Amino acid sequence: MHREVILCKDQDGKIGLRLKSIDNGIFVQLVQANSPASLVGLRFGDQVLQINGENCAGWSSDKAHKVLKQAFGEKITMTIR
Amino acid sequence: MHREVILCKDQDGKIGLRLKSIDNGIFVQLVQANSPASLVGLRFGDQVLQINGENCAGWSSDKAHKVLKQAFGEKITMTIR
Ligand SMILES: CCCCC1C(=O)N(c2ccccc2)N(c2ccccc2)C1=O
Ligand SMILES: CCCCC1C(=O)N(c2ccccc2)N(c2ccccc2)C1=O
C-alpha cells in the first residue's frame, strides 16, 4: 500500500539510503544501520514512488540520488510501497 | 481539523517555535521567519495537541519546550488543530 515517510537529515547532512533504478521504478538497495532511513522503517526492496513531490518512474539511479541531495529544508519526503 | 506535521531541525539544531500553555492546552506563540516551523505552515494561535506521540493537555510551557528539545532523530512530530 501507498505510504508517506518523512526523513530528517542527520547532523552531517546524510540519510543513509542507496537506491537502484530498475523495471521503470526506484527501489531501496541499501539502508544504513541507525540512520534517518532506518528510523522510518525503510527496507531493502521497498519501492520509492515519489521523492519530494516528484514521480520517480523512469528516473536513473543517479537522478534519484541527486534529488535526494537537493532536499529542501533538511527534509526528504517520499512515497513508498 | 486534526493534522500531523513533521519538522526537521535546522543545521543548528533549531526549529523556530515558541509555545504557550493556557486553557489546559498548548498553543503557538511565536513562529520564526524562514524556519522548520514556518516551513510546515505553523501560525500564531495554532493549538498543539500532541508532541512526539504525547498528549500535551495540561503541560507547562516549559515542559512543552523541553519535549521539543528532547526530539528523537533530529525530528519533531506534532498533531495540530
Ligand atoms: C549513515 C551513512 C550515510 C551515507 C548515505 C547517505 O546519507 N547518502 C546521501 C548523501 C547525500 C544526500 C542523500 C543521501 N548516501 C548515498 C548513497 C549513494 C549515492 C549517493 C549518496 C549514503 O550511502
Ligand atoms: C530560528 C530561530 C530558532 C530559535 C527557536 C528554536 O529553535 N527553539 C528551540 C530550541 C531547541 C529546541 C526546540 C526549540 N526556541 C525556543 C523558544 C522558547 C524556549 C526555548 C526554545 C526558539 O525560539
Numbering used by the authors:
A (entry chain A), B (entry chain A): -1 to 79
Publication excerpt:
Herein, we identified four hits—PI1A, PI1B, PI2A, and PI2B—targeting the PDZ1 and PDZ2 domains of MDA-9, using NMR chemical shift perturbation (CSP). PI1A and PI1B bound to the MDA-9 PDZ1 domain with an affinity of 0.11 and 0.34 mM, respectively, determined from the dose-dependent CSPs. To gain insight into the binding details, we solved the crystal structure of the MDA-9 PDZ1 domain in complex with PI1B. The complex structure indicated that PI1B was bound in a typical substrate recognition groove between the α2 helix and β2 strand of the MDA-9 PDZ1 domain. This groove was mainly composed of the residues K124, I125, G126, L127, R128, Q142, H175, and L178. Notably, the side chains of residues Q142, R128, and K124 were rearranged upon ligand binding, relative to the free form. The cell counting kit-8 (CCK8) assay suggested that PI1A, PI1B, and PI2A were not toxic, while the wound-healing assays demonstrated that PI1A or PI2A alone suppressed the migration of MDA-MB-231 cells. Accordingly, the combination of PI1A and PI2A inhibited migration more effectively than the treatment of a single inhibitor, and PI1B also demonstrated a similar synergetic effect with PI2A.
Melanoma differentiation-associated gene 9 (MDA-9) is a small adaptor protein with tandem PDZ domains that promotes tumor progression and metastasis in various human cancers. MDA-9 contains four domains, the N-terminal (1–109aa), PDZ1 (110–193aa), PDZ2 (194–274aa), and the C-terminal (275–298aa). PDZ domains are small, globular PPI domains containing approximately 90 amino acids that form a classical two α-helices (α1, α2) and six β-strands (β1–β6) structure.
